[PDB]
Ligand SMILES: N[C@H](CCC(=O)O)C(=O)O
């Protein structure tokens with residue numbers, strides 16, 4: 001599974017996916033190692049695009 | 062003065078003046094500039110006298126992180142109360158001067174207290190056409206300006222501004238540091254997440270002083286933990302939070318200020334920026350132990 005970071009106007013979201021990648025509507029997204037906060041919150045596998053992804057977001061801190 | 066409550070900017074300024082008036086031989090007020098809406102940028106200078114190197118400490122660059130300004134104000138009081146009694150702060154101040162800016166974004170702070178509790182940016186007007194207000198002051202520094210983690214959209218929370226140092230609040234700090242010339246540590250307070258970080262936010266590679274900055278950060282996190290059991294995670298900005306181009310400690314480090322650190326204070330998301338006022342004092346007390354550990358290391362390792 002590959003892990004990504006997406007920048008949005010009011011928050012930052014990470015995506016951990018298998019057989020998919022974030023859609024263009026998720027903002028400015030590129031592959032990026034997971035951060036502590038990402039691993040803690042992105043716990044559930046949900047059907048995403050062509051695959052499955054775990055995802056969680058945080059505000060700019 | 063109740064240090065366990067959030068205060069208005071007018072209340073904060075009065076307490077800064079009360080500190081100066083009750084401890085004249087140690088504290089003075091230095092104005093370094095003015096905000097977009099023309100409010101004075103006042104720093105507190107702690108000094109025992111003589112031409113010496115300095116530590117810079119700031120808080121409130123992002124308006125909504127109210128535990129930072131409150132912590133900075135309690136810290137000012139803690140230095141004056143413990144000077145001459147605690148051996149550590151006494152010996153720190155024999156070697157170095159401390160400069161403390163409690164409210165780095167005064168326009169944003171007032172707007173967050175009166176109109177919008179989640180406001181982050183400055184209150185400058187956008188040079189477009191834009192209908193949105195404000196620049197992220199922690200994406201406006203000349204260190205990877207415009208890169209990943211900063212936006213060119215004026216309506217975004219991470220908008221970098223038209224050019225590096227466009228925000229008068231930021232230019233006022235850069236000009237002071239460069240004119241001073243002997244700043245040896247640069248520490249900035251943000252909220253939340255419970256993280257103690259060191260450079261790079263603009264890139265994820267290891268900086269030259271990785272091993273020493275990592276050891277100092279881990280020692281500070283240890284000391285912080287000992288009071289109330291609060292655990293912090295440590296690492297470079299890019300890997301522990303996110304990529305963030307144009308940040309202040311990336312600029313300070315690349316300017317030659319080796320001990321450049323950022324704190325994300327309490328909490329981990331339960332309350333987030335809306336930290337209960339009842340947690341101000343516990344947060345400030347434990348942060349002081351981390352701060353003191355870093356300043357001891359700066360005192361002991363001149364360069
Ligand atoms: N969004 C960040 C938090 C830490 C940082 O990236 O330096 C800031 O600019 O406030």
Ligand SMILES: [Zn+2]
Pocket residue numbers: 060061122123126199251252
């Ligand atoms: Zn912040």
